[PDB]
Structures are given as structure tokens and as C-alpha cells.
């Protein structure tokens, strides 16, 4: 502890962000599942048993990777919490159709519809829950009896006194009731008025459009303070004074990248088959005819959706762990422990079986060829990005512990070398610890558990362990590599902004006001680091006239300019578009967020993983590596990306947003809406950009494939 204040710099922001996220985490752990709901007379229709068994069955079926609830999943099949609330609203429109109005929704004229939607609105929004029991009217009993026949188009001894399937729809009805009931002390719902159901009065409250602009005010405060702080005005070379970049376990690391790019290509095959599944889900041009039945049984949309997301995970994950363990032998200085290649291959094949087995379990449970107890563990887990079973999550994190074991083994010498408590060999070994550990948050998670805590612990990995990795490990690797070649804060600001801001997805899943405010504030503060690359991009544009024949690093800068470009675009200006509750209320679970997904995953981290696979370059000479396939890959991947985020997702997304604004979210998700001429033909011409993007993935894939003929 020579200069422990520099440790206290990170310790402070980390302790305050872990206090904020941990205690607002205690707030979303505290602030339900009624033991048994009853009728006005007495009879039961649902129990905690049925809601949690229907949750377990929901997680068995894997409906979260095909039909969204609370906005959190896939966007092919309609939202089974908005659609349920609308179908139950149609049930209340069918029920009271006796006295002061006609039969249908719009059969009664707007003049007399004024006396209609007041009675039901003041039926269930009044607190109807004590004793773990929800008490409901015989009206609501006949409603919950009325709604079930609706649940086609093109969308996927004695003990109890209910069915099993019944438990699923009881869990759906639970999501509906929990979504459409006011809080204690407050006049808004547990979901903060979600979903957008107009006829029950569900729209953002005061805090939403207060903090929506307070976030803008805080962001402009930050921008202003830095920009006016920049007034005082407080290089490794002059014009032409750069040195040459030359240095000569990694036999097996060459296969990690082949795995990586093959998984990237099949990830885009599942992306493309998910693309075709959103055009026609009744057949496949002969082989899957309604008489025949071939493709729809074995490899459905659920499977393409889970496997597209598990491939995106695994190809980028191997795409960075390969770089971690490829740059490992430079950290200690070649200091190889006993049987290191064998351990790296052990880890490699553990990754292989985790990868295969995980989405093979999804194969088995998503087609339901599996018991109840055997789902979740082996089968589909039921959650976006944790689609992989728990067996395989535990095994993946054991792969992360063998990786952190091997990386810590490959930095024991670096840990012995550093006398300074906050050295590069302390930050780049804090980052690897921050990676190899923080997938563990994802395991504090069970099928029979409450869902708020579950998703809290989900975005605790999917927007925390992803963000405290590519902006922390990759950057201390950047410093390390640019130090070792002779070329030469973000972590602290991005883990002060990003760690407590990760709650920006959790506004409409049971969060208190403090969590909304914190989320809003710190998600607003997530922009000011990502916008710093807005000048760094221009600086690059006015610095990239340097490398010639001798300089090996030519095209990776053309990767990284795009990385910074899309890192300004996809998250900074596209994430803060959706950050406000006023827009996220409606946007939550539309094609709008596919733009942010494809543009912030492949747009930022995909090209980064590709750049790190290309960092290939220390096994081939400077003037012998071929680079037409590089430009091919760039033009095709970026043209396909900008194509798929411009031609399709922007217009469909904004159309969907306007439809959600006007007719309602449930309508914006309904098949009557989602099968318009415009939208069907737009989803039909989405595949052009997909062809080009797959072409681009194939180009850079065949580059790294054909790298293997003449290597160093
Ligand atoms: C040719 C390549 C690709 C095609 C054709 C493709 C196509 C698709 C399609 C059609 C969807 C369905 C969206 C929906 O209706 O819900 C999807 C979802 C998704 N894709 Fe891709 N994709 C490709 C590559 C990628 C890559 C390389 C990444 C990331 C590295 C990526 C990340 C995602 C994510 C995250 C989602 C889901 C978003 C969510 O569930 O909320 N895709 N993809
Ligand atoms: C590299 C950085 C980032 C990545 C990889 C990323 C990734 C993602 C992904 C995949 C989703 C889709 C979740 C789902 O549909 O279930 C998402 C949602 C979202 N992200 Fe990000 N994000 C990043 C940065 C940001 C930033 C900086 C902001 C705000 C300034 C932001 C705001 C949002 C919002 C508001 C949503 C909600 C969309 C929805 O639930 O449908 N993100 N993010
Ligand atoms: Ca999603
Ligand atoms: Fe996020």
C-alpha cells in the first residue's frame, strides 16, 4: 500500500456503486406470489403452487425465447402480459354487456362508452390483496374462466385441484394481475403502469417524465462541466518518431479462433433462420409441407432464437477468452506452468461441451422431450442470454474458473513483479478477476424463485459482466499491448456509470422509484464516456494516414474506427433514446431494441472480437497476409449491418412504436397488426441485408480459415 489512494479511487466508485446496486438490489429483492387466490364466495382458481409451477413450466417451455412477458424476451410471438390484459379487457367487455352499453368494444358509441370503462377500471386497480391471498369478484372469476379459450395465424393418489397447463395460464394471469394493480401509498402499478393498456389508464407517472428530463439535465451538466473544465488545456512521437513493432502455449489458441469464427458463422445461420422464421412459420418450400412435417418439429423458432443468442454469447466469449489466454504468455514473460497446453485444451473442450450440451439441452426441452425436474438444469433455462441450462451455466462458470485459474497462473510472475499496488499488472489483473468472477451473479437464480430478483440477477450478468469486461479487460489489454509494442479512467467512469445504470432495463419489472431514479441518473451518466469517442473518431480520421508496407497494423484500425463509431451510435445515442421511461414504456420489447441489440453487440463488441481474432497477426508476416477479404468483410458486414438496421428494423420499429402509441402495445404485438403487407414484405426484404452480412461473415471467416496454409 504505497499509493493506496489510487486504489481508493476505484474502491470508492466500486463501493458506492455496489452499495447503490446492492441496496436498490435489496429494494428490488423486497419490493409477489400469493399462497392461494380465492373468489368472492370462496373457491380457488390459483395458488403460489400454480404460479411457481407455471413459472417452472414457462421456463420448461422456454416461452421467454419466443413470446415476451414484461417486454423481456423475443418479439415473434405476442406479449403474453399485454395480450392477456387485452383479452381480459375483452372478457370485461363481454361480461358487463347487459346494462349501460351494447355487446362489442366499439358497438356502443363514444357518447355512451363514457359510462363503460369507469366501472371495471375501479374494480381491480383498488388493492385486492391481503395472508398470502388475492380476493377477487365473481366477475373476475367468470373473466378468468372466459379468457382461456383464446389461448391462429403464424405465431408460436390426490393432492391439488388444478391441472398443470392451467398453472401456466395462472402464471400468465398472475403476470397480468401483478402488472395491472396499484402499489401501496402510490397511484401507479407494480410495473409502474406497464403495459400500455389505455382502457385501464396505464401511462408513465410524474417521476418518469421528471427523471426523463432530469437525466438530460444531469447529462448536460456532466458534458458542460467536462467541456468547460477542458478550457485550461492541462504523444510518444513528433512527426515521424515511432519505433517498429516486433516480437516473436499458443498452438491451441489458433483453434479457439476457428471455433470462434465458425460459431460466429452458425450464429448468423441461426440469425438468418430466425429471419426466415419471421417471414413464414407454416412451412419451408416443400420439405416442411403440411402433409409432411419435417423442419418445424426438430428445429423450431424457439431453438433458432435460443441458439442465435447462445452462439452470439459463445463466439464472442471464446473470441475474448482466446485473446485473454493468447496475451497471457506475454504477461508473465513466457512463464509456462506444468501441462499448460493440456489445461488450455481441457478448458477449450470444457467450453466445447458446455457450448454443444447447453443448446442441445435447449434442443431437447424446447421440443419437450424431457421431464420437469430435468429442465432448467439440462434443458432450456427459460431466460434470454441464460438460455443454456443451469448444469451448463455452472460448467461455463467452472470454465471461467479454469480460465481465471490459468490466467492467474499466467500472471503469478506479474503479481510477483509489481511493487506498485496500482500498476498495469494490478489493473489488468483486477479486470480478469472482474471477468472470471462476475458471471457468478447469473447463478443466484432458480426456476421456482420470484422473477424480479431473477431478472435483477440476470441483468447483473448480461449488462454488468458484459460491460465490466470489454471496457475493463480489453482496455487494460489495450494499454498492455500498446505498451509492449512501443505505442504508449474509462474503467472507473464506465463502472461508476454502467454498474448502477444497468437497472435501466428494470423499470417495468417491479422496481421502486429510487431504482428508476438511480437507473435514469447513472444510465444518463453512461453516455458521457461513450460520447468521448465522438472526438476520438475524428482524431482517428485525421490520424489514420501513417501505416504503410512495414506497419503490420493497417486494417485493425479500420476495425476500431468502426468499433468507436458504432460505440458512439448503438449505445450512447441509441441507448439514451430508449433510456427514458417515457419512450421505454412503449418501446419495451419492440423491433426498436433489435437495432440497439445488433448495433451494440456486433456493431461494438463483434468487430472488437474480430480485431482480437486478427490479433492471427503474430503468426503471419507483414507483407504476406492477404487483405482483399478484409475490405470484402468490412463492406459486406457493415453494409449488411447498416442494411438490416436501416431497411428493416428502423421503419418496422418506429411503425410498431406508433402502433403501440396509438392502438396499444398488445395491438402493436398482435398478429392482426404484425401481419400487414408493409411489415410482411419488409421482413421479406430484410433477408437481402442478411445475405450480404452472411457474405461478410463468410469472407472474414474464410480469411481466418485460409490463414492456416502458411503460418509462423
Ligand atoms: C446474418 C446475420 C444475422 C441475422 C440474419 C440476424 C437475424 C436476426 C433476427 C431475424 C432476429 C429476430 C428479431 C426478432 O424478431 O425478435 C435476431 C435477433 C437477435 N440478434 Fe441477430 N442476426 C444476425 C447476426 C447477429 C449477430 C452477429 C449478433 C451479435 C453479435 C446478433 C444479435 C442478435 C440479438 C441480441 C438478437 C435478439 C435481441 C433480443 O432478443 O432482444 N445477431 N437476429
Ligand atoms: C456496448 C454497450 C451496450 C450493449 C452491448 C447493450 C446491449 C443491450 C441489449 C442486447 C439490449 C436488449 C435487451 C432485450 O431486448 O431483452 C439492451 C437494451 C437496452 N439498452 Fe443497452 N447496451 C449497451 C449500452 C447501452 C447504453 C449506453 C444505453 C443508454 C445510454 C443503453 C440503453 C438500453 C435500453 C434503454 C434498453 C432497453 C430496450 C428493451 O428492453 O427492449 N444500453 N442493451
Ligand atoms: Ca429481448
Ligand atoms: Fe442496458
- What CATH code is carried by the domain that includes residue 263? 1.20.210.10
SS3 446: coil
DSSP state for residue 45 in the 8-state scheme: E
Nearby residues of 285 by Cβ (< 8 Å), 6 or more positions away: none
Name the residue with the closest Cα to ligand 2, atom 37.
505
589 is in an annotated binding site: yes
Nearby residues of 369 by Cβ (< 8 Å), 6 or more positions away: none
Task: Tally helices (H) and strands (E) across the chain.
Answer: 32, 2
Name the residue with the closest Cα to ligand 1, atom 33.
598
The cell 390484459 sits on which residue? 85
Same domain, 16 and 44: no
Distance 72 CA to ligand 3 centre (A): 5
Q: Which residues of 646-665 are buried (b: 16+ CB within 10 A; e: fewer)?
A: eebbeebbebbbebbeeebb
Using CB atoms within 10 Å of the CB of residue 390, give its burial: 0 to 12 exposed, 13 to 18 middle, 19+ buried: buried
- For residue 90, which of 681, 664, 683, 605 has the smallest C-alpha distance? 664
The C-alpha cell of 343 is what? 489445461
Total tally of structural domains belonging to the chain = 2
Same domain, 315 and 354: yes
Ligand 2 atom nearest residue 589's Cα: 41
- For residue 664, which of 590, 580, 611, 578 has the smallest C-alpha distance? 590
- Residue 136 pairs in a beta bridge with none
469: Cα separation from own chain's centroid: 15
User: How many angstroms separate the CA atoms of 382 and 403, rounded?
Assistant: 27
Name the residue with the closest Cα to ligand 2, atom 12.
597
**Residue that is last in its domain, among 179, 203, 227:** 203
- Residue 36 pairs in a beta bridge with 47
Same domain, 406 and 416: yes
Same domain, 226 and 98: no
Nearby residues of 158 by Cβ (< 8 Å), 6 or more positions away: none
Using CB atoms within 10 Å of the CB of residue 232, give its burial: 0 to 12 exposed, 13 to 18 middle, 19+ buried: exposed
The C-alpha cell of 529 is what? 464516456
Q: Phi and psi of 250, rounded to 5°?
A: -80, 10
- Radius of gyration (Cα) for the chain, nearest Å? 27
What is the sign of the dihedral through the CA atoms of 96, 99, 104 and 107? Answer: negative
Nearby residues of 261 by Cβ (< 8 Å), 6 or more positions away: 315, 613, 700, 701, 704, 705
User: How many angstroms separate the CA atoms of 642 and 453, rounded?
Assistant: 36
User: How many angstroms separate the CA atoms of 693 and 135, rounded?
Assistant: 54
Ligand 1 atom nearest residue 277's Cα: 10
Cα angle 636, 638, 639; round to 5: 60
User: How many angstroms separate the CA atoms of 693 and 267, rounded?
Assistant: 12
Nearby residues of 483 by Cβ (< 8 Å), 6 or more positions away: 424
The C-alpha cell of 61 is what? 417451455
Contact 678, 655 (CB under 8 A): yes
**Residue that is last in its domain, among 203, 226, 243:** 203
Same domain, 189 and 306: no
The C-alpha cell of 68 is what? 415476451
Contact 110, 96 (CB under 8 A): no
The cell 375501479 sits on which residue? 122
Please tell me if the CB atom of residue 578 comes closer than 6 angstroms to any atom of ligand 2: yes
| End-to-end C-alpha distance for the chain, whole angstroms | 43
Q: Phi and psi of 385, rounded to 5°?
A: 80, -25
Nearby residues of 544 by Cβ (< 8 Å), 6 or more positions away: 557, 558, 561
Same domain, 39 and 186: yes
Contact 547, 554 (CB under 8 A): yes
- Residue 135 pairs in a beta bridge with 38
Contact 389, 379 (CB under 8 A): yes
User: How many angstroms separate the CA atoms of 12 and 16, rounded?
Assistant: 6
Which ligand lies nearest to the CA atom of residue 576 in the structure?
2
Cα angle 639, 645, 650; round to 5: 145
101: Cα separation from own chain's centroid: 45
- For residue 598, which of 62, 61, 64, 75 has the smallest C-alpha distance? 75
- For residue 144, which of 36, 42, 44 has the smallest C-alpha distance? 44
Name the residue with the closest Cα to ligand 1, atom 4.
271
- Give the CA count within 13 Å in the CB-facing half-sphere of 95: 21
Same domain, 596 and 497: yes
Contact 531, 572 (CB under 8 A): yes
Ligand 2 atom nearest residue 573's Cα: 30
Contact 231, 620 (CB under 8 A): no
Same domain, 545 and 608: yes
Same domain, 16 and 63: no
User: How many angstroms separate the CA atoms of 705 and 160, rounded?
Assistant: 58
Name the residue with the closest Cα to ligand 2, atom 42.
575
- For residue 698, which of 275, 305, 322, 269 has the smallest C-alpha distance? 269
197 is in an annotated binding site: no
Domain that includes residue 107, residue range: 32-203
Contact 564, 610 (CB under 8 A): no
Among 192, 386, 463, the mutation site with the greatest number of ligand 2 atoms within 8 A of its Cβ is: 463
> How many of the other CB atoms lie within 10 Å of CB of 246?
10
- For residue 438, which of 480, 472, 482 has the smallest C-alpha distance? 472
Same domain, 619 and 473: yes
Contact 619, 711 (CB under 8 A): yes
User: How many angstroms separate the CA atoms of 357 and 347, rounded?
Assistant: 15
Which ligand lies nearest to the CA atom of residue 683 in the structure?
1
- For residue 703, which of 638, 639, 631 has the smallest C-alpha distance? 631
Q: How was this structure determined?
A: X-ray
User: How many angstroms separate the CA atoms of 136 and 125, rounded?
Assistant: 11
**Residue that is last in its domain, among 203, 236, 256:** 203
Helices 607-614 and 301-331: crossing angle in degrees, nearest 10, is 40
Among 68, 575, 578, 660, the mutation site with the greatest number of ligand 2 atoms within 8 A of its Cβ is: 575
Residues with a CB atom less than 6 Å from ligand 1: 74-76, 267-268, 271-272, 274-275, 278, 308-309, 312, 384, 593-594, 597-598, 601-602, 606, 690, 693-694
Ligand 1 atom nearest residue 606's Cα: 30
The C-alpha cell of 503 is what? 437497472
The C-alpha cell of 149 is what? 379459450
The C-alpha cell of 486 is what? 512501443
Same domain, 162 and 280: no
User: How many angstroms separate the CA atoms of 417 and 644, rounded?
Assistant: 49
Contact 603, 566 (CB under 8 A): yes
- For residue 456, which of 522, 398, 529, 383 has the smallest C-alpha distance? 383
SS3 129: strand
Contact 406, 331 (CB under 8 A): no
Same domain, 437 and 552: yes
Residues less than 5 Å from ion ligand 4, measured at CB: 463
User: How many angstroms separate the CA atoms of 216 and 205, rounded?
Assistant: 18
SS3 188: coil
Contact 626, 687 (CB under 8 A): no
Among 75, 570, 598, 686, the mutation site with the greatest number of ligand 1 atoms within 8 A of its Cβ is: 598
280 is in an annotated binding site: no
> How many of the other CB atoms lie within 10 Å of CB of 515?
23
- For residue 616, which of 703, 541, 528 has the smallest C-alpha distance? 703
User: How many angstroms separate the CA atoms of 487 and 439, rounded?
Assistant: 33
Amino acid at each position: 500500500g504505497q499509493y493506496k489512494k489510487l486504489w481508493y479511487l476505484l474502491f470508492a466508485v466500486l463501493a458506492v456503486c455496489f452499495t447503490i446496486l446492492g441496496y436498490m438490489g435489496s429494494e428490488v429483492y423486497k419490493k409477489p406470489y400469493p399462497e392461494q387466490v380465492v373468489s368472492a364466495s370462496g373457491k380457488v382458481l390459483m395458488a403460489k403452487d400454480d404460479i411457481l409451477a407455471g413459472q417452472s413450466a414457462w421456463q420448461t417451455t422456454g416461452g421467454m425465447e419466443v413470446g415476451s412477458v414484461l417486454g423481456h424476451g423475443a418479439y415473434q410471438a405476442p406479449d403474453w402480459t399485454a395480450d392477456w390484459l387485452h383479452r381480459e379487457l375483452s372478457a370485461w367487455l363481454d361480461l358487463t354487456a347487459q346494462q349501460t352499453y351494447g355487446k362489442k368494444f366499439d358497438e356502443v358509441s363514444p357518447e355512451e362508452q363514457a359510462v363503460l370503462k369507469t366501472r371495471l377500471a375501479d374494480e381491480y386497480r383498488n388493492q385486492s390483496r391481503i395472508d398470502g391471498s388475492v380476493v377477487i369478484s365473481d366477475t373476475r372469476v367468470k373473466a378468468i374462466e372466459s379468457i382461456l379459450p383464446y389461448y391462429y395465424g403464424d405465431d408460436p393418489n390426490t393432492l391439488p385441484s388444478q391441472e398443470a397447463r392451467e398453472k401456466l395460464f395462472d402464471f400468465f394471469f398472475w403476470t397480468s394481475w401483478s402488472a395491472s394493480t396499484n402499489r401501496p401509498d402510490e397511484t401507479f402499478t407494480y410495473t409502474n403502469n406497464w403495459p400500455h393498456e389505455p382502457l385501464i389508464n396505464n401511462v408513465p407517472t410524474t417521476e418518469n417524465y421528471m427523471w426523463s428530463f432530469t437525466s438530460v439535465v444531469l447529462l448536460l451538466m456532466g458534458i458542460g462541466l467536462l467541456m468547460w473544465g477542458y478550457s485550461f488545456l492541462t504523444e510518444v512521437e513528433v512527426p515521424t518518431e515511432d519505433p517498429i513493432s516486433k516480437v516473436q502455449s499458443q498452438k491451441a489458441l489458433g483453434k479457439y479462433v476457428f471455433l470462434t469464427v465458425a460459431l460466429f458463422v452458425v450464429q448468423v445461420l441461426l440469425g438468418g433462420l430466425t429471419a426466415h422464421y419471421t417471414v413464414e412459420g407454416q412451412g419451408f418450400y416443400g420439405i416442411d409441407e403440411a402433409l409432411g412435417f419435417e423442419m418445424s418439429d426438430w428445429f423450431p423458432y424457439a431453438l433458432t432464437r435460443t441458439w442465435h443468442i447462445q452462439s452470439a454469447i459463445f463466439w464472442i466469449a471464446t473470441g475474448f477468452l482466446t485473446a485473454g489466454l493468447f496475451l497471457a504468455p506475454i504477461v508473465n514473460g513466457g512463464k509456462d506452468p506444468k501441462f499448460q497446453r493440456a489445461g488450455v485444451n481441457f478448458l477449450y473442450i470444457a467450453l466445447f461441451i458446455v457450448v454443444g450440451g447447453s443448446y442441445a439441452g435447449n434442443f431437447f426441452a424446447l421440443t419437450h422431450i424431457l421431464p420437469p425436474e430435468f429442465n432448467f438444469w439440462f434443458g432450456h433455462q427459460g431466460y434470454e442470454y441464460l438460455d443454456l441450462g443451469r448444469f451448463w451455466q455452472l460448467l461455463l462458470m467452472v470454465g471461467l474458473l479454469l480460465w481465471l485459474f490459468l490466467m492467474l497462473r499466467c500472471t503469478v510472475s506479474a503479481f510477483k513483479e509489481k511493487g506498485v499496488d496500482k500498476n498495469l499488472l494490478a489493473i489488468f489483473v483486477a479486470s480478469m478477476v472482474g471477468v472470471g468472477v462476475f458471471y457468478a451473479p447469473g447463478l443466484f437464480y432458480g426456476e421456482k424463485s420470484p422473477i424480479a430478483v431473477m431478472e435483477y440477477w440476470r441483468w447483473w450478468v448480461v449488462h454488468l459482466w458484459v460491460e465490466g469486461f470489454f471496457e475493463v479487460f480489453a482496455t487494460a489489454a489495450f494499454a498492455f499491448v500498446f505498451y509492449n509494442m512501443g505505442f504508449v479512467a474509462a474503467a472507473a467512469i464506465f463502472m461508476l456509470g454502467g454498474v448502477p445504470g444497468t437497472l435501466h432495463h428494470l423499470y417495468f419489472s417491479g422496481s421502486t422509484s429510487a431504482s428508476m431514479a438511480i437507473g435514469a441518473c447513472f444510465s444518463a451518466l453512461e453516455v458521457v464516456p461513450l460520447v468521448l469517442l465522438g472526438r476520438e473518431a475524428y482524431e482517428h480520421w485525421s490520424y489514420q494516414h501513417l501505416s504503410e508496407w512495414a506497419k503490420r497494423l493497417r486494417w485493425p484500425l479500420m476495425c476500431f474506427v468502426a468499433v468507436a463509431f458504432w460505440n458512439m451510435i448503438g449505445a450512447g445515442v441509441f441507448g439514451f433514446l430508449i433510456n427514458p421511461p417515457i419512450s421505454l414504456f412503449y418501446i419495451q420489447g419492440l423491433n426498436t431494441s433489435a437495432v440497439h441489440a445488433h448495433a451494440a453487440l456486433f456493431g461494438v463488441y463483434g468487430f472488437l472480437a474480430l480485431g482480437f481474432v486478427l490479433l492471427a497477426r503474430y503468426l503471419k508476416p507483414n507483407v504476406q497476409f492477404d487483405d482483399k477479404l478484409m475490405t470484402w468483410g468490412f463492406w459486406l458486414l457493415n453494409g449488411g449491418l447498416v442494411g438490416m438496421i436501416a431497411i428493416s428494423l428502423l421503419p418496422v420499429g418506429v411503425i410498431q412504436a406508433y402502433a403501440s402509441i396509438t392502438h396499444g402495445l398488445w395491438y402493436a404485438r398482435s398478429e392482426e397488426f404484425l401481419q400487414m403487407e408493409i411489415l410482411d414484405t419488409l421482413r421479406w426484404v430484410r433477408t437481402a441485408a442478411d445475405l450480404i452480412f452472411i457474405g461478410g461473415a463468410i469472407c472474414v471467416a474464410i480469411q481466418a480459415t485460409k490463414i492456416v496454409f502458411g503460418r509462423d
